Amino acid sequence: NEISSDTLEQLYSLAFNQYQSGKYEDAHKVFQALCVLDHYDSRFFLGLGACRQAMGQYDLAIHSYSYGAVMDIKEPRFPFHAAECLLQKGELAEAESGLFLAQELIANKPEFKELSTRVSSMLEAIKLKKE
């Protein structure tokens, strides 16, 4: 029945607002349904994964980020947030690839300035462990 409008934007705004109020459980329910309505929009998977990350659900988060990565191969926020989750699980080699990928996708784009510094900080911590 996807002759559904851009009431999709109304739903995204609501889920976005719930997330900023720390209502992660409610936000995740909306984001989940949005992923059902339009499985090609990457904001919905970033949102869904973010809620799972916020609630400590690392494997579920990585799963949503993986999907987002498939539909938006240029978006560095997916491997970067997955790398965070993989770090929390103590999976350092996998986290490293995540960070290196993010770094490739960010390149020297000005909008990801602070995000670059976090990436480098994490790569430096994993690097020293292998000594």
């Binding site: 934007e9 995204y12 705004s13 976005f16 997330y19 992660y24 904001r43 970033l46 949102g47 994964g49 973010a50 990350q53 916020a54 926020r77 947030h81 965070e84």
Partner: peptide, 9 residues
């Protein structure tokens, strides 16, 4: 510090 989402509309 939770992940930062894309802004709406």
């Amino acid at each position: 510090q939770v992940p930062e989402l894309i802004k709406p509309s």
